[PDB]
Design a protein around this ligand. Structure first.
Ligand SMILES: Cc1cc2nc3c(=O)[nH]c(=O)nc-3n(C[C@H](O)[C@H](O)[C@H](O)COP(=O)(O)OP(=O)(O)OC[C@H]3O[C@@H](n4cnc5c(N)ncnc54)[C@H](O)[C@@H]3O)c2cc1C
Length: 453
């Protein structure tokens, strides 16, 4: 176990009670460095490990599609941890109040959590630190190379982050040790009841069409650790060979469809990389897929960790901020409100089709996501308004939303983060432009539009 994966958030006097793993981002029992590190510290102090998950007050800012996908995975996860004799405790409320109360009530010895560079997780960490006196650690269980180890600063391009990450792959890309069970079982409600009351609170804001029928289709992605491994296995056996050639075709289901599991932490990216690396397939397709799950996925964490305003106009590159400012007063071709963007009521059928796929499946195709966000910038009153509209629609309806990938993806599409300057245009400036005619020359746009009416 590499000690570079764990960081100390607060020193203190160790108690003699169970080591608490405050699971937030990596919701799985297998291939979890944070859970393995908690078990090892628990073994060293002769004390069992315990698992605590907080059901926060911010679930109403999202939809039923993410609430059910997350909770249905936790229901499977509770069974899996119980078989290895680790108990799980699900608290409802503020992590700053619930974690501090749980630590004091249960005489917790050491507190451990997983790593997340999002602002809301840092808000919880500040509150928890102020109310505990035991040691507090955090472990990077989401990235193959720890976020603080891959780079010590913000990387302005993938070609500058790629050699750094690949040089540390031989050290950090390793097999996971088996999660040992607790020696004996140690000494706040049923998740089914919490899911029932939560869904009832989210029903009035459900995404419906004119016929009052729900718009979301929940049969596209089954949640759970077991389902994530089946989707991963299918991708390697059926879709990895053709990934490098058809990853930009939204009319083909050639993507891995691993993002909803990767976002909630139901499957480890390191596990996916290990299986992909030992598979035999198209080397161009393997290189393309590893470039997406290693470089671009972990550079998103690098973006949010080293840019406090990762969701603001200030984090854009200087060339993009100057270009967008020089085109602020340019007359936009069209101006759509948030409701018009949300309902897919724009003049562009391709954009509307992309929005319908987001509304119905909860997972828009990777290529159309770039077109979807770049057209928001073209049809907004300001780049700051486009950032708000893109982030709102992304986090509300994407099953993988509220993720560092989305904010880094949105920053690339609108602010040119991790991109270069292109030909200068009106309104958009030097930001990379994607036209409707360009998409038609790339794939069958008519089929994609007809699929999502
Ligand atoms: C405007 C916009 C919004 C996005 N919103 C999200 C989002 O809300 N949540 C999210 O997790 N990703 C988002 N992405 C990144 C990307 O679109 C998705 O990760 C990808 O489409 C998810 O489907 P997939 O797993 O089948 O892709 P695959 O091609 O099968 O790649 C597998 C994994 O590689 C990673 N990956 C692939 N492409 C990217 C990328 N461009 N950036 C970062 N990581 C990537 C993902 O973790 C992905 O799960 C967004 C990108 C853009 C341009």
């Amino acid at each position: 176990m590499n000690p570079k994966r764990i960081r100390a958030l607060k020193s203190g006097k160790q108690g003699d009670g169970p080591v608490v793993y405050w699971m937030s981002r990596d919701q799985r029992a297998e291939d979890n460095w944070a859970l393995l590190f908690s078990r090892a510290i628990a073994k060293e102090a002769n004390v069992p490990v315990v698992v605590v998950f907080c059901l926060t007050d911010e679930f109403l800012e999202a939809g039923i599609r993410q609430y059910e996908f997350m909770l249905k995975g936790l229901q499977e996860l509770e069974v899996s941890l119980s078989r290895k004799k680790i108990p799980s405790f699900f608290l409802r409320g503020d992590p700053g109040e619930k974690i501090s109360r749980f630590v004091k009530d249960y005489n917790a010895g050491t507190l451990v959590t997983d790593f997340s560079p999002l602002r809301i997780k840092n808000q919880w960490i500040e509150k928890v630190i102020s109310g505990i006196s035991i040691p507090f650690f955090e472990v990077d269980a989401h990235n193959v190379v720890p976020c603080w180890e891959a780079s010590q600063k913000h990387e302005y391009a993938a070609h500058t982050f790629r050699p750094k990450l690949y040089a540390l792959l031989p050290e950090f890309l390793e097999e996971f040790p088996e999660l040992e069970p607790n020696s004996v079982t140690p000494e706040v409600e049923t998740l089914s009841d919490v899911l029932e009351t939560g869904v009832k609170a989210l029903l009035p804001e459900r995404a419906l069409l004119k016929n009052k029928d729900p718009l979301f289709e929940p049969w596209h992605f089954e949640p759970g650790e077991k389902a994530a491994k089946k989707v991963m296995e299918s991708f390697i056996a059926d879709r990895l060979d053709s990934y490098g050639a058809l990853r930009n075709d939204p009319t083909k289901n050639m993507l891995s469809n691993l993002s909803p599991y990767l976002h909630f932490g139901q499957i480890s990216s390191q596990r996916v990389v290990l299986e992909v690396e030992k598979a035999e397939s198209n080397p161009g397709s393997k290189k393309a897929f590893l470039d997406e799950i290693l470089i671009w996925k972990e550079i998103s964490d690098n973006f949010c960790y080293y840019n406090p305003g990762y969701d603001g106009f200030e984090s854009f590159p200087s060339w993009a901020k100057e270009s967008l400012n020089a085109h602020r007063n340019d007359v936009r071709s069209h101006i759509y409100t948030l409701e018009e963007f949300e309902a897919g009521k724009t003049h562009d059928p391709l954009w509307n089709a992309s929005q319908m796929e987001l509304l119905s499946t909860g997972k828009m195709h990777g290529y159309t996501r770039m077109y979807w966000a770049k057209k928001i910038l073209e049809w907004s009153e300001s780049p700051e308004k486009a950032l708000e509209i893109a982030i709102c629609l992304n986090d509300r309806y994407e099953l993988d939303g509220r993720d560092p990938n989305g904010y880094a993806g949105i920053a690339w599409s609108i602010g040119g983060v991790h991109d270069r300057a292109w030909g200068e245009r009106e309104v958009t400036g030097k930001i990379r432009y994607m036209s409707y005619e360009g998409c038609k020359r790339k794939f069958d746009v008519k089929l994609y539009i007809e699929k999502y009416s």
